[PDB]
UniProtKB/Swiss-Prot annotation, chain A:
This is Cation channel sperm-associated protein 3. Pore-forming subunit of the CatSper complex, a sperm-specific voltage-gated calcium channel that plays a central role in sperm cell hyperactivation. Controls calcium entry to mediate the hyperactivated motility, a step needed for sperm motility which is essential late in the preparation of sperm for fertilization. Keywords: Calcium, Calcium channel, Calcium transport, Cell membrane, Cell projection, Cilium, Developmental protein, Differentiation, Flagellum, Ion channel, Ion transport, Membrane, Spermatogenesis, Transmembrane, Transmembrane helix, Transport, Voltage-gated channel. Testis-specific. Residues 124-143 dip into the membrane without crossing it. GO terms for molecular function: voltage-gated calcium channel activity. It catalyses: Ca(2+)(in) = Ca(2+)(out). In contrast to the human ortholog, not activated by progesterone. Activated by intracellular alkalinization. The chain crosses the membrane at residues 16-38, 51-67, 76-102, 150-175. The chain holds residues 94 to 315 of 395 of the full protein. The lineage of its organism: Eukaryota, Metazoa, Chordata, Craniata, Vertebrata. GO terms for cellular component: acrosomal vesicle; CatSper complex; endoplasmic reticulum; motile cilium. It is a multi-pass membrane protein.
Curated annotation (Swiss-Prot), chain B:
It comes from the Eukaryota. Pore-forming subunit of the CatSper complex, a sperm-specific voltage-gated calcium channel that plays a central role in sperm cell hyperactivation. Controls calcium entry to mediate the hyperactivated motility, a step needed for sperm motility which is essential late in the preparation of sperm for fertilization. Residues 187-199 dip into the membrane without crossing it. The keyword Oxidoreductase does not apply. This is Cation channel sperm-associated protein 2. The chain holds residues 94 to 374 of 588 of the full protein. It comes from Mus musculus (Mouse). The gene is Catsper2. Component of the CatSper complex or CatSpermasome composed of the core pore-forming members CATSPER1, CATSPER2, CATSPER3 and CATSPER4 as well as auxiliary members CATSPERB, CATSPERG2, CATSPERD, CATSPERE, CATSPERZ, C2CD6/CATSPERT, SLCO6C1, TMEM249, TMEM262 and EFCAB9. HSPA1 may be an additional auxiliary complex member. The core complex members CATSPER1, CATSPER2, CATSPER3 and CATSPER4 form a heterotetrameric channel.
UniProtKB/Swiss-Prot annotation, chain C:
GO terms for molecular function: calcium-activated cation channel activity; voltage-gated calcium channel activity. GO terms for biological process: calcium ion transport; cell differentiation; flagellated sperm motility; fusion of sperm to egg plasma membrane involved in single fertilization; regulation of calcium ion transport; regulation of cilium beat frequency involved in ciliary motility; spermatogenesis. It comes from the Eukaryota. Residues 38-46, 100-110, 175-185, 199-215 are extracellular. Belongs to the cation channel sperm-associated (TC 1.A.1.19) family. The chain crosses the membrane at residues 16-37, 47-68, 77-99, 111-133, 152-174, 216-241. This is Cation channel sperm-associated protein 1. One of its GO terms (cellular component) is sperm principal piece. Residues 186-198 dip into the membrane without crossing it. It comes from Mus musculus. Disruption phenotype: Mice are normal but males are sterile. Male sterility is due to defects in sperm motility unability to fertilize intact eggs. Sperm of the CatSper1 null mutant lack CatSper2 protein, while sperm of the CatSper2 null mutant, lack CatSper1 protein, suggesting that stable expression of CatSper1 protein requires CatSper2 and vice versa. Residues 69-76, 134-151 are cytoplasmic.
Curated annotation (Swiss-Prot), chain D:
It comes from Mus musculus (Mouse). Belongs to the cation channel sperm-associated (TC 1.A.1.19) family. Residues 1-14 are extracellular. The chain crosses the membrane at residues 15-42. This is Cation channel sperm-associated protein 4. Pore-forming subunit of the CatSper complex, a sperm-specific voltage-gated calcium channel that plays a central role in sperm cell hyperactivation. Controls calcium entry to mediate the hyperactivated motility, a step needed for sperm motility which is essential late in the preparation of sperm for fertilization. It comes from the Eukaryota. Testis-specific. Component of the CatSper complex or CatSpermasome composed of the core pore-forming members CATSPER1, CATSPER2, CATSPER3 and CATSPER4 as well as auxiliary members CATSPERB, CATSPERG2, CATSPERD, CATSPERE, CATSPERZ, C2CD6/CATSPERT, SLCO6C1, TMEM249, TMEM262 and EFCAB9. HSPA1 may be an additional auxiliary complex member. The core complex members CATSPER1, CATSPER2, CATSPER3 and CATSPER4 form a heterotetrameric channel. Disruption phenotype: Mice are normal but males are sterile. Male sterility is due to defects in sperm motility unability to fertilize intact eggs. It is found in: Cell projection, Cilium, Flagellum membrane.
C-alpha cells in the first residue's frame, strides 16, 4: 500500500483532485496510513480499539476499487448524489421540526416520557424509529399513559406524513433517475452501433465502386 | 412402439388428464397424512395407510413414467433442460422407498427435503399458464440483468458486517446478567444474521434499546455508524432494485413497441406492394 | 304477467325503484351506522333490531320485486347476484330467529356472529346502492387505471401463494418435534409464514430458535424470507408502476 | 395483537376466521396503499421530468 501511494504521489494528483474514483482511493490511502501508523506503533494517549476491522474493511474497499463494470455502474448512479443529499436535508429538517415539537409536547412537561421525547439524542433516535415502521407499537403504549390523548393522533399524523413521504419520494426519485440515466446511455450505445453499421456499409459501397471501376478499366484497356 | 408410444401417450388427452389428476391428488393427500398418526380414529387408520400406499403407488407411477422416458432419446436426455431437473427430482422421490426398505430410517432421514422437492416439481409440472410463463420469462431475464447489483449488495454486506463485528464488541462481551440480545453480535455468522436483520429493518428500535444497555459512551461513533449503515443500505438497495426491475419492464415494453411498429410498417409496405402488383397486371 | 307486465315492470321499476329504493336504503344505512357504533347500542338494544328487522323486511320486498322482474338478466349482474345471496342468507337467519325452540346453543353464539357479519355485508350492499350518484370522476379514472392490470397481479399473487405454501410445507416438515406449539397445525403454520412474510418478529423467531438446539433453520428461514420478500414486493411495485405509467404516457 | 385474540377456542374457533379475514384484508390493503403511494409519486415526478 505504501508502494501504491508512491505511484499515486506523482504529478497525476493534478487529476486526483477533481475526478471521481481517484480522489476516493487516495483519500482512502491517507485514512488507511495515518491510523495504523498511530495504532500498530501507538505509544500515545488513546481510548480503546474500534478501528482494526474497520481499517481492514477500508482495505477491502480498496480491493473492490477495481472491476470496471462496477465503475460504469458507479458512473451511471453517481448523478443521484445531489438528489439524495437534497432528500436527506429534507428528512433532517422534518426531523428537527418534529424533534422540537416532541420535546415541547412530552419532554418539557417533565411528568414522564423521559429518554423518549426527553433528552435530545434519544428523542432524535425515537423520531427516526417512529418515521420508520419499527418500534411504533411499544412507543405508542409508552406515550398513551402520560395523560395525553392527542399524542396518539399526533404520532399517527407524523407517521402518515414522514414514513410515506420519505419512502415513496425516495423510491420514485431513484427509479426515474436511474431510468433516465440508462435511457441516454442505451441510446448512445445504439447510435454508436448504427454509426458503425453505416460506416461498414459505406466501406462496402466504396469497395464495390472500386471493383466496378477496375473491371471497366480492364475491359477498356483489354 | 418406443418413441412412437411416448408421442402417442403425450398426444392423447386422457393420459394427460390422468397424470395431472394424480399429481394434484398427491399434492392434496400429502399434507393430510402428517396431521395424525395415532389411534384417535381407529376406523380411519387402515384407510389412511391405504392413502399412504396410494402415495407409494404414485411413486410406482413415477417409475413407469421414467420407463416412458426411456422410450425417448434415452442417453441424450441425461443432459438437457429443466426436464433433467425433473428426472433428478423423480429419482430423489423414488429414493425414500429404497432408504426405508434398507436404511432403517431411525436417523437423519431427510425424507422431508425429498418430499418437498417432489412437491416443488409437482407444483411446477401443473400445465403452467401463459400469464405465469410471461412473468417467469421476465423474472429470469431480469435476474440475468442482475449481474452487478447483487455483487455490490453482497460486498457492502461483507464490508459493513465485518466492520460491525468489532464495533459493538462491548455488547455480547459484557458481564451484564440481564440481557437478551447478546448472541446477536457474538459470532461472525451471528453478526451476519443480525446485520441481515438490520437490512430487513425489523425491530431496529427494540434492537437499539437493547444495545442501549451498553454503557453509553456519548453515542459518538457506534450508534451513528449502525444507524447510517441500516438506513443507507436499506434505502439505497431497495431503490436500486426497484429501479432496475422498472427499467427491465421499460426495455421489455420498448422492444415490444418497436416490434409491433416494425410489423405495422411491414404490413403497410405489403399493402403498397399488393397495390403495385394489382396495377402491374 | 307476460311481456306486457314486464314492460310495465320496467317503467314502474325505473320510477318507483329510484324513489323508494333510494329513500329506504338511505334510512337503512342511517339506522345501520347507528347500530354498529359500539357505545350507542346500550343507548338502545330495543329500537335497533326492530328497525333492523323492518328494513330487512323492506329488503326481502326488494328481492320479491326483483324475482317477479325481468329475471334471467337480473342474474347477469354480479352485484345483483351478491344481493340475491344476501337476501337468501337474510331470510334464512330471519326464519331461524322466528322459529325459536331449537336444540343448539344460542345467546351470542358463533352463529350469531355469522349473522352479524352477514348484516355487515348487507350494510355494504346498502352503501354500494347509495353511490349511484356522484362517485366523482377523478377517483373513477384512478380506480379504472388501477383495475387495468388484473391478470398480472393475479399471476403474481398466485406465485406468492405457491411459494408461501411450499415454504410452509418445508418449514412444518423441518419443525417436527421442534417445540411446534406455535405452529402445531396447517392454519398456524400458514399464519406463522404470513408473519415471516410481513416482517413481524422474525428476529424474535431467530432469538427463540437460538435458545433451541437447531441452528441451520435460521439460514434456511432467512434466505427464504429475503428471496420471497424482495421478489414479490419488487414485482408488485414495478408492475403497478408501469400499469399507471402507460396511462401517464397517454392523456 | 396476534397473541391478543389468540386462544379463542385453542384450535380453530373464530381464532381462524377473524384472523384470516383480517390478515388477508391487511396484506391486500397494505400492498395496495404502498403501491398507490409509489405510483402517484412517480406519476407526478414524470411531470417534473417533462
Amino acid at each position: 500500500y505504501v508502494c501504491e501511494f508512491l505511484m499515486k504521489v506523482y504529478v497525476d494528483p493534478i487529476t486526483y483532485w477533481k475526478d471521481g474514483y481517484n480522489i476516493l482511493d487516495v483519500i482512502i490511502l491517507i485514512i488507511l496510513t495515518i491510523p495504523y501508523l498511530l495504532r500498530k506503533i501507538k505509544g500515545n494517549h488513546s481510548a480503546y480499539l474500534h478501528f482494526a476491522d474497520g481499517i481492514q474493511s477500508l482495505r477491502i474497499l480498496k480491493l473492490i476499487s477495481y472491476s470496471r463494470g462496477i465503475r460504469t455502474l458507479i458512473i451511471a448512479v453517481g448523478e443521484t448524489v445531489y438528489t439524495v443529499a437534497s432528500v436527506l436535508t429534507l428528512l433532517f429538517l422534518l426531523m428537527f421540526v418534529f424533534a422540537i415539537l416532541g420535546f415541547c409536547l412530552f419532554g418539557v412537561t417533565d411528568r414522564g416520557d423521559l429518554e423518549n421525547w426527553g433528552n435530545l439524542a434519544s428523542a432524535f433516535f425515537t423520531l427516526f424509529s417512529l418515521a420508520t415502521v419499527d418500534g411504533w407499537t411499544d412507543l405508542q403504549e409508552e406515550l398513551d399513559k402520560r395523560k395525553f390523548t392527542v399524542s396518539r393522533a399526533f404520532t399517527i399524523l407524523f407517521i402518515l406524513l414522514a414514513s410515506f413521504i420519505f419512502l415513496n419520494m425516495f423510491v420514485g426519485v431513484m427509479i426515474m433517475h436511474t431510468e433516465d440515466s440508462m435511457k441516454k446511455f442505451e441510446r448512445d450505445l445504439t447510435l454508436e452501433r448504427n454509426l458503425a453499421i453505416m460506416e461498414e456499409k459505406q466501406i462496402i459501397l466504396k469497395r464495390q465502386q472500386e471493383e466496378v471501376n477496375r473491371l471497366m478499366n480492364t475491359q477498356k484497356s483489354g | 412402439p418406443l418413441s412412437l408410444w411416448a408421442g402417442w401417450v403425450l398426444d392423447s388427452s386422457v393420459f394427460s388428464k390422468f397424470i395431472i389428476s394424480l399429481i394434484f391428488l398427491n399434492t392434496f393427500v400429502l399434507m393430510v397424512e402428517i396431521e395424525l398418526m395415532e389411534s384417535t380414529n381407529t376406523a380411519l387408520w387402515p384407510v389412511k395407510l391405504a392413502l399412504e400406499v396410494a402415495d407409494w403407488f404414485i411413486l410406482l407411477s413415477f417409475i413407469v413414467e421414467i420407463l416412458l422416458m426411456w422410450l425417448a432419446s434415452f442417453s441424450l436426455f441425461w443432459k438437457d433442460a429443466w426436464n433433467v431437473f425433473d428426472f433428478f427430482v423423480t429419482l430423489l422421490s423414488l429414493l425414500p422407498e429404497l432408504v426405508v426398505l434398507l436404511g432403517v430410517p431411525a436417523h437423519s432421514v431427510w425424507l422431508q427435503l425429498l418430499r418437498v422437492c417432489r412437491v416443488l416439481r409437482s407444483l411446477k409440472l401443473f400445465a403452467r399458464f401463459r400469464q405465469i410463463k410471461v412473468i417467469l420469462l421476465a423474472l429470469v431475464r431480469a435476474l440475468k440483468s442482475m449481474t452487478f447489483l447483487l455483487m455490490l449488495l453482497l460486498i457492502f454486506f461483507y464490508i459493513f458486517a465485518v466492520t460491525g463485528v468489532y464495533f459493538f464488541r462491548e455488547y455480547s462481551r459484557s458481564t451484564i446478567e440481564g440481557l437478551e440480545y447478546n448472541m446477536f453480535f457474538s459470532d461472525l455468522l451471528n453478526s451476519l444474521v443480525t446485520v441481515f436483520i438490520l437490512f430487513t429493518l425489523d425491530h431496529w428500535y427494540a434492537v437499539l434499546q437493547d444495545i442501549w444497555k451498553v454503557p453509553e459512551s456519548s453515542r459518538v461513533f457506534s450508534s451513528i455508524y449502525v444507524i447510517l449503515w441500516l438506513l443507507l443500505g436499506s434505502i439505497i438497495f431497495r431503490n436500486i432494485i426497484v429501479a432496475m426491475m422498472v427499467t427491465n419492464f421499460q426495455n421489455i415494453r420498448s422492444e415490444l413497441s418497436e416490434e409491433m411498429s416494425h410489423l405495422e410498417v411491414q404490413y403497410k409496405a405489403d399493402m403498397f406492394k399488393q397495390q403495385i402488383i394489382q396495377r402491374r397486371q | 304477467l307476460l311481456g306486457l307486465q314486464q314492460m310495465i315492470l320496467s317503467l314502474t321499476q325505473s320510477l318507483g325503484f329510484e324513489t323508494f329504493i333510494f329513500i329506504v336504503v338511505c334510512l337503512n344505512t342511517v339506522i345501520l351506522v347507528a347500530q354498529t357504533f359500539t357505545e350507542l347500542e346500550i343507548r338502545g338494544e330495543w329500537y335497533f333490531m326492530v328497525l333492523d328487522s323492518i328494513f330487512l323486511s323492506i329488503y326481502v320486498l326488494e328481492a320479491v320485486l326483483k324475482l317477479i322482474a325481468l329475471g334471467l338478466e337480473y342474474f347477469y349482474d354480479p352485484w345483483n347476484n351478491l344481493d340475491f345471496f344476501i337476501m337468501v342468507m337474510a331470510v334464512l337467519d330471519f326464519v331461524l330467529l322466528q322459529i325459536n325452540s331449537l336444540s343448539y346453543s344460542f345467546y351470542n353464539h358463533s352463529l350469531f356472529r355469522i349473522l352479524k357479519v352477514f348484516k355487515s355485508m348487507r350494510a355494504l350492499r346498502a352503501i354500494r346502492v347509495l353511490r349511484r350518484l356522484s362517485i366523482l370522476t377523478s377517483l373513477h379514472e384512478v380506480a379504472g387505471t388501477l383495475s387495468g392490470s388484473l391478470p398480472s397481479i393475479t399471476a403474481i399473487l398466485t406465485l406468492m401463494f405457491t411459494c408461501l405454501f411450499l415454504f410452509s410445507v418445508v418449514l412444518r416438515a423441518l419443525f417436527q418435534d421442534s417445540d411446534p406449539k406455535r405452529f402445531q397445525n396447517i392454519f398456524t403454520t400458514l399464519f406463522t409464514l404470513f408473519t415471516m412474510l410481513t416482517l413481524d418478529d422474525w428476529s424474535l423467531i431467530y432469538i427463540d430458535n437460538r435458545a433451541q438446539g437447531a441452528w441451520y433453520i435460521i439460514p434456511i428461514l432467512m434466505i427464504y424470507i429475503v428471496i420471497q420478500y424482495f421478489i414479490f414486493l419488487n414485482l408488485v411495485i414495478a408492475v403497478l408502476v408501469d400499469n399507471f405509467q402507460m396511462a401517464l404516457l397517454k392523456g | 395483537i396476534y397473541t391478543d385474540f389468540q386462544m379463542d377456542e385453542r384450535e380453530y374457533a373464530m381464532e381462524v376466521g377473524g384472523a384470516i379475514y383480517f390478515a388477508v384484508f391487511i396484506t391486500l390493503g397494505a400492498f395496495i396503499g404502498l403501491n398507490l403511494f409509489v405510483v402517484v409519486v412517480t406519476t407526478n415526478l414524470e411531470q417534473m421530468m417533462k
